[PDB]
């Protein structure tokens, strides 16, 4: 799981190991050690070999630094992402999909890890699904009724309005639903009673 | 040079001796004695990758000669990635284990051996769509997943002078 | 002197609002590069192709070749990871039902075509038709184009038959008209706007998709993003190949000619110039490929985010999923890239009205619960903010707070008691 | 070379003269006069910041 951080550590270590091992390369010079060349050859002869070693080692150092710049750009991208996830997942609740884990994000918790961060993404995943018959609207006295916040479902014979993400059916009354139209335009409208809370109250 | 000399139908003019390719390589040559045109093709070369199941699991090894027709190189498979030698081709599709390429992956499975198959992108699931049917969840799950993000690397400073010209 | 578009003085006044009485459904296309070609340059064979003397001279440079090969292999594995992150976002492989009762919306041009040997749709086919040996190998991608099309087809089928529910958990079916009513709520337009205008909305969607097809068939500059990636990888490779025909100061650019002409003590001197130049050329290539692959990885991260938020959900982020209010998006594979058909709601046919922040009645101030007070000159209605649907102002429409001696611009009217 | 020589607990084998690190940098030596093993550490260096 911690592969993402261990890989970064390993990459940096490999870059340093390559850089150090580059010190044992002749690069076309007589020897890979400056001390041996200095002790054996006089300066007029040794300067060419030292120039070869200098060019090779400077190119090695430049390659190391340039790949470090590319790798640090990658780490800055990841750190910008982690800062965004700290701001949105930890300091808020994110409506972005899959930004704070699969599911509907509830919260997140940061945990420091060596050279990184670990987000414990708490998410709500709907579990046990039931089939129902659904209708876009409901005809009652000619009017078309649509759920204020919910969906019309039928357990086979009866019609309820439930919230969309969790089956909690409720009797369809005028507080659950709002009216728009005359039941001629909706494609899939169904006939059913819409209760009126005020009617029994006025009756009694 | 070094290569395979195949008699070719290049339309060499009488005053032309060799035909450099776009890459300015002598693709074809006129034979000095018999005035005939011979295309030159480099001798077969490619990468050699080794599909291993893990030394702890097994020491069996399948070898991918990348991008060479098997006829130009016991079980032999001609994948679009190259010639796979030592992996038994299987019609069943499982998840990708060792990605070989071109939709083909290898895995160590049952007497056990390395098998090369076309990877399966998960289980097919036709949704029970209907114009008046809805699925509504009656319960839930509180899942705590984990996300791991690198934040910083090791701060290294290299003395250019001491590295290049140590003392 | 270039023009920065057209001048427009918005008719602002402290008591006037413009409310759209109609709308358009616009499908725009967003092309994002996802991966690049997985080349791999054999450092030894490029520098010293079939030359033992040159290879031994190259061994004196240490691990330059090994680290260049490691860099290019990392780039190749990264390209495969980019493709996986964009497309393998669907756990299962969903299929559209045999009966396409999608409320009049017609996806036949984006749903896969059985007649084609590939699981490839009409528009994916158009996009694919549009976008077009010296140690230099090209590894095939792990996922074939047929597998990429299977992935985008599963994404499409899950989207159409389940909404955003498949992004969160198990795909829960919902009729496409009902899903569209949900996605209308997502942008602040009531459900009845979809239900009462369903045929018009479906026709606008179908016509928008048809215009997408026609634009793709006629003009090829849309896929310029992915093509530019192709033309940059190819150009880099061609420069790398053409750098083999440089002396770099040597007597010749041909190792075989150098070797056949010079005894080894004299030859090495020129072979070293060839090695230095060619190794520098390889380093330049690999560095720019690392930079270019970082750019492609940023692009593929964006494409994965747009798949998650535009396709697996509905985005409240502005202009993230097309200009307008995002309703839904559809992924289409493309060569080394993805194409999103961002379906958006664009309000239309705006009209002027007189707007009041609150309405005084019986001394108390009323504000609309959801909506805005407008007046067509004499009568005051409370309407949705993104679609003109006036309603009589009652106490269900409005909520009271305080008296009328505080609010600036409050008008006088009647909130009918139901 | 240049460095600081300290007594070492490394168990050299009799035929071995000196010991190298992972990156093939001389890490220990054996004194030819007295058959004893000395660890060689680089003389301390570091950036001077102000
Ligand atoms: C659909 O739901 C309705 C109401 O929830 C069910 O009607 C009730 O059923 C219970 C037994 O399950 C009875 O005790 C009640 O008296 C019923 N009330 C009414 C008003 O009918 C109905 O049985 C359910 N139908 C199905 C097929 O599940
Ligand atoms: C819902 O109920 C209404 C009336 O309660 C039905 O309208 C009737 O439709 C039939 C056939 O179309 C006509 O013969 C009647 O005259 C209509 N009645 C009225 C009062 O207009 C409507 O058909 C029902 N819907 C469904 C799907 O059954
Ligand atoms: C919703 O799911 C939870 C489990 O995720 C159910 O809780 C389990 O209930 C069974 C039987 O009552 C017990 O044996 C388990 O120990 C419970 N698990 C946990 C974690 O509490 C719960 O009953 C489900 N509710 C519905 C309405 O289906
Ligand atoms: C809303 O705009 C649509 C067009 O975007 C109008 O539909 C057009 O109506 C005209 C005249 O009725 C027809 O000729 C066109 O064929 C229709 N186009 C489509 C795509 O159906 C619609 O009438 C407008 N509605 C309002 C209330 O202004
Ligand atoms: C969805 O759109 C396609 C093309 O826009 C329709 O296919 C056309 O169908 C008509 C007959 O209705 C044929 O004459 C055309 O040749 C077809 N064109 C193509 C490209 O297939 C398709 O019918 C539409 N879907 C529905 C359900 O009508
Ligand atoms: C503003 O809108 C109101 C509400 O529709 C208009 O009042 C109605 O106007 C129609 C004719 O357009 C009459 O048939 C109704 O009797 C009117 N109703 C009432 C309650 O007066 C009103 O005319 C519109 N005013 C302007 C200036 O457009
Ligand atoms: C809205 O109506 C209220 C009362 O119905 C108006 O308040 C009157 O304001 C005038 C002038 O300031 C006073 O002379 C009256 O005594 C006020 N009436 C009451 C009952 O206090 C108010 O002016 C109206 N607002 C507008 C914009 O016309
Ligand atoms: C809904 O009905 C279809 C019809 O066959 C069935 O395949 C599916 O499993 C049902 N869904 C549930 C949750 O039972
Ligand atoms: C659903 O589609 C079927 C045909 O597939 C049709 O007969 C039926 O009337 C439709 N029902 C609704 C509610 O749209
Ligand atoms: C000698 O070379 C000439 C010119 O290439 C050719 O025409 C002729 O056949 C050759 N004869 C022999 C003896 O090879
Ligand atoms: C390999 O060569 C044979 C002989 O021509 C040919 O039939 C076959 O198609 C080749 N395979 C590939 C993958 O090129
Ligand atoms: C796989 O199936 C094809 C046809 O479905 C058949 O020709 C081939 O022999 C099978 N391969 C194996 C290893 O069984
Ligand atoms: C609203 O009124 C102003 C008054 O100048 C006019 O310029 C503007 O076009 C009007 N808006 C519409 C939609 O007609
Ligand atoms: C709008 O401003 C004008 C003058 O610019 C002023 O007469 C009027 O009272 C203001 N209306 C509101 C509602 O503030
Ligand atoms: C060299 O002589 C010294 C005595 O001064 C002795 O301690 C040491 O072991 C000798 N080293 C040999 C014989 O290698």
Record the SSE blueprint.
This is part of a larger assembly, with four copies of chain A.
Chain A: H1 3-21, H2 34-40, H3 43-90, E1 104-113, E2 116-126, E3 129-135, E4 138-140, E5 143-147, E6 151-154, E7 159-162, E8 170-171, E9 177-179, E10 190-191, H4 198-203
Parallel strand pairs in A: 4-10
Antiparallel strand pairs in A: 1-2, 3-6, 4-5, 5-9, 6-7, 7-8
One 2-acetamido-2-deoxy-beta-D-glucopyranose (NAG) binds near residues 11, 350, 351 and 352 of chain C.
Protein name (chain A): Spike protein S2'
PDB class: structural protein
Keywords: SARS-COV2, spike, glycoprotein, antibody, beta variant, complex, neutralising, convalescent sera, viral protein, immune system complex
Question: What are the defining features of this structure?
Answer:
alpha+beta; part of a larger assembly; 4-stranded mixed beta sheet; Spike glycoprotein (chain B); 4 chains; 10 strands; 4-stranded antiparallel beta sheet; binds 2-acetamido-2-deoxy-beta-D-glucopyranose
